[PDB]
Each structure stands twice: as structure tokens, then as C-alpha cells.
Design a binder for this molecule. Sequence first.
Ligand SMILES: O=C(O)[C@@](O)(COP(=O)(O)O)[C@H](O)[C@H](O)COP(=O)(O)O
Ligand SMILES: O=C(O)[C@@](O)(COP(=O)(O)O)[C@H](O)[C@H](O)COP(=O)(O)O
Ligand SMILES: O=C(O)[C@@](O)(COP(=O)(O)O)[C@H](O)[C@H](O)COP(=O)(O)O
Ligand SMILES: [Mg+2]
Ligand SMILES: [Mg+2]
Ligand SMILES: [Mg+2]
Lengths: 450, 449, 449
Amino acid sequence: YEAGVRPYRETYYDPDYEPKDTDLLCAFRITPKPGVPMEEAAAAVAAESSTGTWTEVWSNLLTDLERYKARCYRIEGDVAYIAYPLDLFEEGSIVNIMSSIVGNVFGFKAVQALRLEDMRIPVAYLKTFPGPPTGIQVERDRLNKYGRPLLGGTIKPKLGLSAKEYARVVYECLRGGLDTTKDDENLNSQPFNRWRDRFLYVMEAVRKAEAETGERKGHWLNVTAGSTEEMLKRAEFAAELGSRYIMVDFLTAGFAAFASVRRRAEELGLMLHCHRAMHAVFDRQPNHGIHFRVLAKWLRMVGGDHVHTGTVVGKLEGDRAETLGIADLLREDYVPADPGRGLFFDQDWAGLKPVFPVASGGIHVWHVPDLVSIFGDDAFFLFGGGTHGHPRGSRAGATANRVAVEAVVQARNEGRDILAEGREILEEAARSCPELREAMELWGDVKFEV
Amino acid sequence: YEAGVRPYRETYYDPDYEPKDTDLLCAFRITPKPGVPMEEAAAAVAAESSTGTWTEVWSNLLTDLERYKARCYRIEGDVAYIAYPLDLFEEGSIVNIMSSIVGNVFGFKAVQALRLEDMRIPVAYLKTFPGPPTGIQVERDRLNKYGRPLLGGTIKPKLGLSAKEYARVVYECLRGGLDTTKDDENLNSQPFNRWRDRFLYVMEAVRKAEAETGERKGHWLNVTAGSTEEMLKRAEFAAELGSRYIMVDFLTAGFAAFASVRRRAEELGLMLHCHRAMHAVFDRQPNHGIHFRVLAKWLRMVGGDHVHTGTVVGKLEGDRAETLGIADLLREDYVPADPGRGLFFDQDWAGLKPVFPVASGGIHVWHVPDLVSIFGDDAFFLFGGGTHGHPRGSRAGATANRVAVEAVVQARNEGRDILAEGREILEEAARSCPELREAMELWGDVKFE
Amino acid sequence: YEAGVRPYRETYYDPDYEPKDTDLLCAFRITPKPGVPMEEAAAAVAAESSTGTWTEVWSNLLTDLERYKARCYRIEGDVAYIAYPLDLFEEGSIVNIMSSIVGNVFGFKAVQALRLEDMRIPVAYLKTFPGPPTGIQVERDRLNKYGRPLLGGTIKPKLGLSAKEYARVVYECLRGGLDTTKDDENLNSQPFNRWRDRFLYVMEAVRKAEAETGERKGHWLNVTAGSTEEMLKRAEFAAELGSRYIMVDFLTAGFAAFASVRRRAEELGLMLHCHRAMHAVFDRQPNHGIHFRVLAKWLRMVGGDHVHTGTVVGKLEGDRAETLGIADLLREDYVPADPGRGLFFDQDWAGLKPVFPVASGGIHVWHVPDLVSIFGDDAFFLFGGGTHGHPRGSRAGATANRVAVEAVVQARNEGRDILAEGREILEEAARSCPELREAMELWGDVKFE
Ligand SMILES: O=C(O)[C@@](O)(COP(=O)(O)O)[C@H](O)[C@H](O)COP(=O)(O)O
Ligand SMILES: O=C(O)[C@@](O)(COP(=O)(O)O)[C@H](O)[C@H](O)COP(=O)(O)O
Ligand SMILES: O=C(O)[C@@](O)(COP(=O)(O)O)[C@H](O)[C@H](O)COP(=O)(O)O
Ligand SMILES: [Mg+2]
Ligand SMILES: [Mg+2]
Ligand SMILES: [Mg+2]
């Protein structure tokens, strides 16, 4: 035992280490404090996230740190790779991954900025998580919808509508052609709209709309609440009414209470829509935070049936190539590394079920050619403002978005180029769908930069 | 119904609105997309965090948005003040606040960067929250420790120690002078140290140091787990073992599960230490994210007996002026606005109990003067590497830290200037404390900017 | 789809397949029906224990059997190696392992005799099991006994003693040196000895001997019973009586109820002793059955704190080399393959706790040199008859055994060869121990091949 401060890089930087198939790997993009070498910055991350602290302790000899310590085994410019033994992590606890990988190391003076770019979840650890409760293939059997993207839309205004007027919009939306509707992430239970009331009005509207159109419907009822018990209570009520769905804000509620809801959802036979509220607070800026592809893996492991992935072309920021990767990370059984899409590691999913990507935010009919091209069939397209903002109301807007999606799908199956002939495909449909014509006319000049 | 895309400013920018005592106020620091004027950007965050979306909708006429919409009532350079009516929020739900205020507005193409600097929790809303379960005064009475900062320390290595060897460190720590010790934030239940074993071994050590020193002791037993149900199971076991505390990572576990644990800790009589793991993931950079003072207000509203606030002088980043303001926001009944410390609003706490600030990370004896100067008596100082890193082990290092604290409080009470005579005071105690001398020699050249 | 019976070898024998680190591997010894070639017989076992049946089915095309079928990838004489993909199994179910591997493949007219020799449990599957609740090291801490084999003994007669007289024997065994005692495997709750009476009488005998000797003591109360709820009910009662241990016949009770009891034992703080009654019904003959080492692996996966391993030199059959390999499987973190000890695969235990080997059956003082040399310190030695059969009763027989173990352990630590000087070491101790001298004379001609 030699007591004193020694640089982190003397025990937590091993550029000869060969990662094991059981190790959990991370890809950090580091911005050292000027004068702190990259090696010392990566080693301090590897140390203060695993087993080390700022000085040598006697207790380090009471154990075998050669077996448990994390190691930075590679450095490519400002990107550090760190390998974590399997025995460091509690089984089936995303809460434990985060408490190690992103617990304290983002606030060290020596590291001025840090972003977790990607994480390789090893198979032996993945077998400790249940994955989504339903999945794409089962859910498509419960909805009896095959061969196209699924249509949805958030009810607007976000807040302010009574429970009755709320379900009146839902009803106009569903009967008009939308497969589903949802509560806004910030609509939980408020003086103007209490949850029990909204749950009772909405299911009436959901049943009524299903009965008239003959197509199965659903409304993503938001059980997000200030406690675990309250969310489980609201999920219990949603099932007693026959809802196929509930909705949770998995980041604002938190991964501990998210897991609790996910387990109850399966027990109740509910499908679990997942809203990524708060993700932009730490997955937006390239120099600091946690990329969303890491949050998506965590979401699939815990088990969400859908999760928002972005629109690229809409009102919220989303890089295309990155989104194309995140979609495969959510849907595929094995995703190989692809620097072109930001995938730093291969990702074997060990048989877990796939998650529905959801494309929401400031989209309309003109975006459907791009949206079908980006996501394919296995995804939801949500038109909130693009539905209720139609000159003639929500039912007229729902019809327009449904005909637009089905028109673009049919064109692709026929072999047409939906990106070149997108306008022509939409204009053809408009010549027999006044709802679509009016929709196109209104939002013909509404574009966001990509 | 006039359909079409309208600017967010036409309805969500009202520079004449007088904020109400019942409104929830937010101070946002905005970096608009070039070409997007400031007023519009501020209006986009107001609209999309309350009632509005990207285009007009007929259903806007089915409610009275004049009563419910959020409004940017003031702009000062790149700082936008936005008022939210009281009816917008669910009673007693931090999760709801976060789902509005920070839900989607941080990811809009029009607002390149956005940081929430401060939030005014109106009293009528604060009355829907319970506050800490124990508080400072009751805690100190349960511990029978008065007149000084309280000593603590995280057991090291963070991970790897068997239950047996881990509690032996604990025993040496509490025996040597520490009041408390704690499970590292990332120590939950792992193959090398399962939570049931650790709880049993550790509490034996606790009861054994308490009996040998005569002083009441405690260990912060981390119940953080992958699910709520599991955290409540472990909080139950800790209570059955006569532990005075439990510990939880409230940000990684999350605010919904955190509320579940806080409620059970009171029912069980446990005091609740809270670790802010994950905070620097969105409170570090000054142009984007959420300042920690806001996270500290929410913490106090749900009910944490302590929370980490940083050290200023330690290894982790933390600003002195700001940190002073976060200490008051945690301990005082009322805090007036203070641009120098980053307090954008007056904050009445409506009779909620205070929270213990905790200063931990990369600190040693040479920091004790500054620390006592910054926080005073009502605060914990945790020495992890500064206790186990001593030349003679945890026992000796814990005596050096306990002695350094009591020597700086004694001098402070005698009228000395514990900053000007910081070195002298410590050297006087070292005359009577060989442990302290070794601790000062070892880390004499270890500083942080 | 070509309907019809096709040989198993066409789709279930792939000698070019390279096993993966996630596959589950099996070493079968096969005795084909005369005329059935080894490849076909091996393919049968692989097929009928994974995906196939006696004829082609149209439903084979509704899935990718290339992804889920088992494959006999290697044959070495009469030994077939079969790899099973990881998806075929249910996470955390030994029951599911047995339903597949040993469910129907042992009764086929095509395979006259089939013996499972060994099984490679992949790390990715081991991480779905908890392992032992307590483990060797935590168990020694609870007893505060270190650095020697631990003494035990089965109360005799197996059946017939009243709860009173039963606990009288227990007291005379614990007071006289033995660290523990145990119910017999077939002693559950009977008209002559109901379980509640025995539980109350015995704990009085445990507490009384712990106070007269100053050493911690324990008794292995058999909770085995006709249903899972009855076993759990008896465990709860054992824990309310302050017992450190319960006992369960994990093979006769079954792996499903075993897992139920094991989960409740940890929840109740109970150390779990596991008797392997019925093992010899299907691990004795070398041409048919399941070798015990496979059962030992499952035991440690579910979670036993001890399990019997045989004595080698006692009254029950047991091979020395194989037993040595079984001990390593029960105690070590990684066991490399070793054809000398019948270990067909490397076994990585992925951090699970170790299991105490237990040597019982027809052993007396003269066997202590061999037993120590075979097992080392981490092991229980059980002397049922070897204790009560002492010329002067149980108290005297317990002392004679406790001294023989401690006198052989002291000699080994001093450097002596406890095998060459086994007789001498015991006679030297018998000088200061009459009880040991009397036992050595009594059984001086009792030997088992
Ligand atoms: O709050 C909103 O703006 C929405 O209701 C969209 O409204 P419109 O449908 O009227 O645009 C969705 O929550 C966002 O799209 C979420 O963004 P992400 O999916 O990127 O989390
Ligand atoms: O993980 C660590 O580094 C610590 O155990 C400190 O150990 P030393 O005291 O031995 O450095 C604490 O968790 C940090 O201080 C928390 O940071 P904050 O105080 O910002 O929450
Ligand atoms: O029933 C018996 O014979 C015993 O009580 C031994 O009595 P003694 O101590 O009087 O011999 C044990 O259960 C057997 O040794 C078990 O066999 P195994 O060890 O093979 O499981
Ligand atoms: Mg929304
Ligand atoms: Mg820590
Ligand atoms: Mg027996």
C-alpha cells in the first residue's frame, strides 16, 4: 500500500486489453480540461465510473481490482472506448447501468464536456431483461392491421380541454381514419381535465369509433403521475375499461417506475406507448449528454412497445442517418456497427421483441413520401396539428392523412419512386379526395430545414 | 376557425402580462436558430410547453386558452420569463412539472439551445407537496449531534468489496471519528456484494462502532434498484435492521419511484439521503440543460432529508456563489432573488422542512477551513478517498477529518478568521493529533482550480 | 414440403458445426439398438430433445429450424456431443432444462441405454439463476468458524424417536463437539415425531448447547413435505424459532418446489442444506442415467448452501477422482475440463456463490485423514452412527470426532503427511483424548471398498 494521489491513467488505461463478449462497452466523446491529456481524461471516466476514486486507499488491497475495474482500451482522437466487466452491474436494472456509466463522471473539473455516444449491451446481460411486452408482430395481430404504417395523432390543445370536449376530438379523429390517438405528454390529471373523467369519455369514443368504421382503434391514455402507485392505479383503470393501450413518460417518470408500469402492463394485457419527454435536455448537443441511441437500447431492454424516434423532416431536430440506425436498433435482431449511422458497436438483441418507432412532430401530408421512405411500414405516424389543423376539422384531417399514407404505400408496392413522384402521387390522390387537396393547399409552404 | 400556421408570438408573447402569485414562473436562457427573432423563440417554448402546437386547430375554440396558455411576459437579452397558470399542473407531481416545462421544448429546430435557469414554485402549488420527512432539527435530535458539520465518507473501492470486507471498512470509519458512511451511488446489488449480505454485515459494524465510541452512528444503505417494488423491499429490510437511514439515487431511479420511496421511508421512520447521480448530464453546460438549483427545488418538494450540492473546492465542478444560493434554497424558509448567486425569483417555501446540504468529492483536511466557511454547521462533509487514503488506513484518516472539523469550528467560535488562519489552526490541532499531521503532509500539494 | 419419415441424421447431425459460447452443450454416452448406427442414434437424441419428431411435418416450414435445432457436432466412440441454442431454454428454469435434455430421449427403442455425463451451462444462461443464498464464506462468518472442516451428524435411529428424545440426542451431539446435527432425509412429520414438536424441542437443544460450549451451533431442520406450501410454512416457523438452517430433500421434493423454498430461505435469512435423496436411482449405473456432477451443477444454479457429495471411503458408492471434480464444480469460480475427473467441458460459474460439499455415510474417526486430504477445509463431515455408536454415547462420540478432525488439521498445517502418518496422528491425539481412543478401538476393523 503506497498512499497518495497518482494519475488515473496508471491503473485505468490499458490500451492492450481485449474486450470480452461479456464486457459492457461504452463510446465516450471527451473534451478534456486544457492541460489534461486525453489519456488522463478517459482514465478518469473509466475510474470514477467503476471502482476508483481520487487517491489510493488501503481497501483496494482487500479485493481484486484487476477483475472488476473498468478499462479504457482504445482512443481514436476525442473518442474513448471503455470496457466494463459483467460482474459490475446488477441484473435487470437500467437504474444500475446509469448510476455507474453516467453517475458522477459528467461533472468532473478535469473533463469539461462528455457525451456517451453508444453502448454495447452484452448478450449475457441482455438475458436479464424481459424486453417489450407485446412487440410489433403481436400488436399487429391485436389491431388486425398489416402492410402499412399506422396512423396516430396527439389531441390539441395540449392542455385546457374538458374530458368531454376532449373525447369529441378523439372521436372525430378515430372515425375519420386514424388508427389511434394519444394524451399529450403533459396531460396527466389536472383541474380542467381529471384522468378518471378523460378515461371514461375517451373509451366511449374509442368504442363508438371502432363500431362505426369497423377498424380496431386505440387511444394512448397517459398514466404518468407523481408516484409509482398512482401510475399503476391509472393503468388498472384503463384495463378495466377495455383499453388496449396506456401511455407513460418513461424519462420524466423515471426508469424505476417505468419498469414497474411495464410489468403491470403485461400482467393486465395492456400495450405500452412510451414518450421520450425530457430527452432533448441531454441528447441534443453533440459535445455533452447522452445520445438517444443509448436511451433507445435502454427503452427496448426494459420493454416499451413503441417509442418516439423523430421525424427528421418535422419541427423537432433529428438527423436522418442517425435515425435510420436507431430504427434498426429498435426493430432488428442483430444490428452491425456502422460509422455512417453512428453505430459504434454491433448489437445482438438475444431474441428480445422489437419496438414500434413513432414519428411525431410538425408533420403533414406533404411529409408522407419522406416518412414512408425513412421508416417503412413498421412505424407510427402521428399527425396532431396536421389533423386538427385541417380547414374542416379533425375528421377531415384524419381522412386526409390516411388516404395520403395509403396512397404512398400503394405507389411503393407498385414500384414507383415515392421520393421523386411524391408530389405526383399526392396530387393524384387529391383529385379524388378533397380533404387531401385542402390539406395540401394549406400546408404547401410549411417546411422545416433538414 | 382560421386554419393555418401562425407565429407563436401572436398568442404566446404578452409583454404586458402581470405575473400572478399563483403562476409558475420560469427563467429560460435561449439561443434561437439564426434568423428566428428572440420574441418568437420565447413564444415557441411558451406554446409547446403548455397549450399550443405548430398550427392552428379548431379545438382551440372548445376551451378558453386565454385562461390556460403560458405567456412569455418579459425578455432580457437572451433570458425569457414565462408564466404558467396554476391550473396547468397536477397537484404534488414533479413528474408533471417536468412533462410540461422540459418535455419537448429543448429539441425544437427553432431554438438551437435552451437552459432552464430558475423556477418560481408558487405557494399555492407548494402546499400540495409534503416536503422532507425528517428535516435538520429532527435529524440532529435523532443523532444527538449539535454545533458542527456532520462527518461522513463513501466506502472505497466503489465496487468490488465483499460484504465482509466492506463492513470492516465501515467499522474502522465509524470507530475512528466519522458520524456516517455511505454506499457508493453505483453499489446496488451485484454478484460481488449482494444487498442482503451488505445490509446485515454493515449494521453489525454500525452497532459495534456506536457501542465503542458511545456516539450514535449511521450508514447510508443504498436501496436504488431496477424497480420501485424492489427499492421498497430493500427499504423495508433496512428498517427491520434498526438502520437510521436509507439512500436513493433519485435521478437515475426517477422522480416517480423517488416519491414512492420517500413516502415509505417516513412510514418506516427512516431518514432519506439523496444522491444526485446523473445531474451533470444536464446541469453542467451553461447553454443547454437544467441548472441544478431547479433540481434542488424539486428535491425539496418531494422530500429528501439531504442532497449533494458539491464542494466548490473538490474534484467536481461547482460555483461558489451559486452553491451558496443552493444551500439557502435547501435550508431556509424564504430566499430573496439575487442575481449575484443566480436566483431569478423570490422563493417562499411555505413551511416545508429544510434539507441537509452534503459536500463530497475530492476533499481532504486542507479544505475544511473553506468548507466550514461556505456551508457552516448545517451540512455534511463526506471524506471518501480522504479517509481511506490516509497513510494508516480508514481509522486514522477518520480521526484526522473529525479533528480537523472540530478544530475549525472551535476557532470560528473563538472569533478567529478561519480563512486567514486556516493553515495555522490546522497545524495547532496536528500538534495533538498525529493522524492529522500525516493527513496534512500527504495531501499538502493536492489542489483543484 | 416433402412429407415422410426421414432419418434423424439428415437434419440433426452436423459434424461441421462450431459450438458457440451461448449454446448449451451435452455429453451423452449412447448405447444404440443393434443395427442403429451411432450417428443416427445421436441425431435422434438431438432431434427428440429439441425440435424434431418421428416424421417430417408441414409446420417445420413455419419457423427457421436452422436457428433452433440441436446439433450433434462431435462423436468420440460412444460419446455424442450435442449443442443446444440459447433460445431453446426458459431463463432460470432447471425444470425446463430437464424437460428438454432428459424428458423423452431416455426411453426410445432406437437407443437401448443413454447416460448424460456432463453439461456445459453457458454464462449467458447462468446469469438468469441466483445461485446459493448464503455461500461458503458468508456461512463461516455466521458461525465464526474458520480453518477446519465443519462437523455434523444425522440423528439416529432414522425414525421412531419422540420429539423429546430426539432433541436429547441433538443436545448430546452439539454439547460434545459437533458443530451441527440434522434430521434424516426421511424424517418429515410423522405420528411418532411431528414437525412442530421437533422444531421446538431441537432449538431448545441448540440454544442450550451454544450456551454451555460458547460456540455457535445449528441444526438442519427438514422442511421437506408433500406440497410447496407445507415446506414454506415449516421454513417460516424454523425462522421464527431462530434456527440458522433448514433442510430440504431437493430431488424428492422436486426442482420446482426446491426453487420456491430457496427463494423463501433467503427472504427469511435461512441457510439451506440440501439432501440429494433419490440421486442413486439415476446416477449409479455407468450405462444409463444422469451422472451426479450434472445434478450438482443444477443444484448450485438454483441455490443450495450445502449438498452431499459422497465420502468415497464410506458406506455409499463414490469414485475418488470424480468426487474431486465435483468439489471443484461446487466451490470454484471456473473449472477447466479434465478427462481424468470426468469433466467434459470447461465450466465458468459467472460469479455464483460456492456450495459446501458434504461427506456423510458410514464414516468414523479412522476416515478423517482421508477425508481431510480429499476435501480440504471447506467441507462438512457428518458422523451419524460414528457419533451415537460410540461406546459412551453421543457426547463422547462427538468429542472423539471433533478431536480427530482438529488433530489431523493441525498435523497438515505443521507440514506432516496426513496420509502416511494418518494412524500416528490419531494415536498421538488419543493420548490426551480417551473418547478418541475408545472409538478407534471399536471401529478398528470397519472398512468399505
Ligand atoms: O407535443 C408535441 O409537439 C407533440 O404532441 C406533437 O404535436 P403536433 O403533432 O401537433 O406537431 C409530440 O409530443 C411531439 O412530436 C413529441 O416530439 P418527439 O416525438 O420528438 O418526442
Ligand atoms: O463517487 C464519488 O466520487 C463520491 O463517492 C466521492 O468519493 P470521494 O469523496 O472519495 O472523492 C461521491 O459520490 C461524489 O462526491 C458525488 O459527487 P456530488 O458530490 O457532486 O454528488
Ligand atoms: O441416511 C443415511 O445413511 C445418512 O443419514 C448417514 O447416516 P450415518 O451418518 O449414520 O451413516 C445420510 O443421509 C447418508 O449418508 C446420505 O447419503 P449421501 O451422503 O450419499 O447423500
Ligand atoms: Mg406531445
Ligand atoms: Mg459515489
Ligand atoms: Mg440420512
